[PDB]
């Protein structure tokens, strides 16, 4: 069995990794070894049955020592730790999850469902250094991947509802709390049918004014609320070479944050670069991978299963709403949605790991 | 002074129409007449200090003897009244808020900010109905103005947050309600500091699917989700309401989010012509006082282009202004604006005090 280490297994992005990893009997091929810059030596979480203690994720020695690495410790570690490592001639595995790395010559993004032929080439090539993609450009691929995988697009636009979990475990409750502050504010005349909701509204849009809302993550509220904001920016470059395109394939558009906890959803116009039906495009989508789930744009079934609370926790990254825009047959429109945590963060890192043991 | 009729101004949108009149002094020029299928002939409201009394919504003599009627019932009763005035001969001015005759050859889409000349045309070419338009195309057009008043748009894609006050004050309430069911069934662990995140989303996201959320009038969850859905885009609207002579496409998405009254849209316009930047924020700043440009920084956009921002508001500000790698003939915007204020009763308003 190879020797892995874990970094950054406690935080939320880790801790998904870890559920997964423990649902898919991940750890019975390895052997883990856990790091932490706490409490080196205490107690290790025995994920993998194991009985260890945790090392010093910050002892170049100890991590030497190691076949693989899987970090969710973020970028701050990996600029640290990455060029010690390889500058000391370390030529083992590196699994991230932070971008850092993403546009190095001699790393690829991972997202094998979509690009296994580059995964395979590269690691045959002697890449030792596999990164996770933008948590958008992710779930964008992995539902129109059928579309890219034949060469069909020629650009993409896009405007997207991103999720609190994007931000992190701090932005996910701010949210969830500023939840209970409109309400209570509110309950009473809520409760009570005799009310006039214009009464009910300038209250809340009051207190959203007030500066009794918790916005220290965000800046500014987002419950009842979204932000055009999100602190290459569509992930042209990263889009372009996790396919390892010929041409350039622009992707642009807008990215705004709402208030949903784990799921990203994605509104596009794509380009297409032939007039295909649109059933064709079902064909297409449907078979490329078994999670592109195809929604038919009718009005039941679309709100059932293309939303964040149909998606969230699960592994489906649905497409709907396909239809040709007035501006064209040649002009393609589709909305998607996907768990952020899984296909947008861990997945391909525990994926990766498989091939790799 | 002309008499002017009211009908449906009890609810919603009634409510902001009266309020805003009230505020800007617009029942002075008038003589009131309200009506209200519910209590005829009882005790009416005092806005333009007025003393009078409630009026049989569907007696066709009491609205003949109009001049102007300002609806906000709907096309329910739009659709019933209307032509029997009509075939029976009524001339007087029709200001409605349903879309039930925004498409009438003998029918204008009022939004004077941006159409004046095509109401004040239609006006001299005798058109006596006037009906407000898309709650989306308006508020478009309120930010994007000065790009089509220049013949600088090809066509728009879209993709839009729609707040719940376009469906109603039932839904505006569901929603809120809905924040409610989330908030409490976690309260305990968002208390504790040492919670585990993936627990409390694990209750959140199972009782989002238990189905003890009320979801009557949206039919699924709306708090912490959203619904590519809407019970389209406006492309016919919009060339009415610019009465162009090409037609410009105007498609994309409409989904609904979890905000109360603003709409907020990001776009993907393509123009004719290489317009830089700083041309595109003077025409768009230029055309009318309503069209705030918020520059491409972090913090002003954060503390401008927002529902939280412009709710309850008569701004409809236009953000993110910049070229998509697509090309220099690509240009991407966000947009937004309140449902209820321009893309709803404003409109009415404003025709009705030109007609006064």
Avoid at 29 to 41: C, D, H, N
């Amino acid at each position: 069995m190879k020797n892995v280490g874990f970094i950054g297994w406690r935080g939320m992005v880790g801790s998904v990794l870890m559920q997964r990893m423990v649902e898919e009997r991940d750890f019975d091929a390895i052997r883990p070894v856990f790091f932490s810059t706490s409490q080196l030596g205490q107690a290790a979480p025995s994920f993998g049955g194991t009985t260890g203690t945790l090392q010093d994720a910050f002892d170049l020695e100890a991590l030497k020592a190691l076949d693989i690495i899987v970090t969710c410790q973020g970028g701050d570690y990996t600029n640290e730790i990455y060029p010690k490592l390889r500058e000391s001639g370390w030529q083992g595995y590196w699994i991230d999850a932070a971008s850092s790395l993403r546009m190095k010559d001699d790393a690829i993004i991972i997202l094998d469902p979509v690009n296994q032929d580059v995964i395979t080439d590269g690691l045959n090539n002697g890449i030792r250094t596999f990164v996770g993609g933008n948590c958008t450009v992710s779930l964008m691929l992995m539902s129109l991947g059928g579309l890219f995988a034949n060469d069909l697009v020629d650009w993409v636009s896009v405007a997207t509802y991103q999720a609190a979990s994007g931000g992190g475990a701090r932005h996910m409750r701010e949210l969830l709390t500023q939840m209970g502050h409109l309400y209570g504010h509110v309950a009473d005349e809520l409760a009570t049918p005799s009310s006039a909701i214009l009464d009910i509204e300038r209250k809340v849009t009051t207190l959203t004014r007030s500066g009794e809302l918790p916005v220290d993550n965000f800046g500014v509220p987002l419950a009842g609320s979204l932000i055009p904001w999100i602190d290459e920016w569509k992930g042209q470059a990263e889009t372009n070479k996790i396919l390892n395109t010929s041409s350039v394939i622009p992707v642009d558009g807008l990215c705004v944050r709402v208030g949903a906890l784990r799921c990203h959803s994605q509104a596009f116009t794509i380009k297409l670069k032939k007039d295909v039906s649109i059933p064709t495009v079902e064909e297409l989508l449907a078979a490329h991978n078994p999670w592109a789930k195809v929604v038919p744009n009718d009005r039941e079934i679309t709100m059932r299963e293309l939303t964040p609370a149909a998606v969230t926790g699960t592994l489906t990254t649905p497409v709907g709403r396909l239809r040709k825009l007035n501006m064209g047959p040649e002009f393609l429109s589709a909305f998607t949605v996907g768990d952020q945590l899984l296909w947008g963060a861990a997945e391909p890192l525990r994926r990766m790991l498989r091939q790799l043991a």
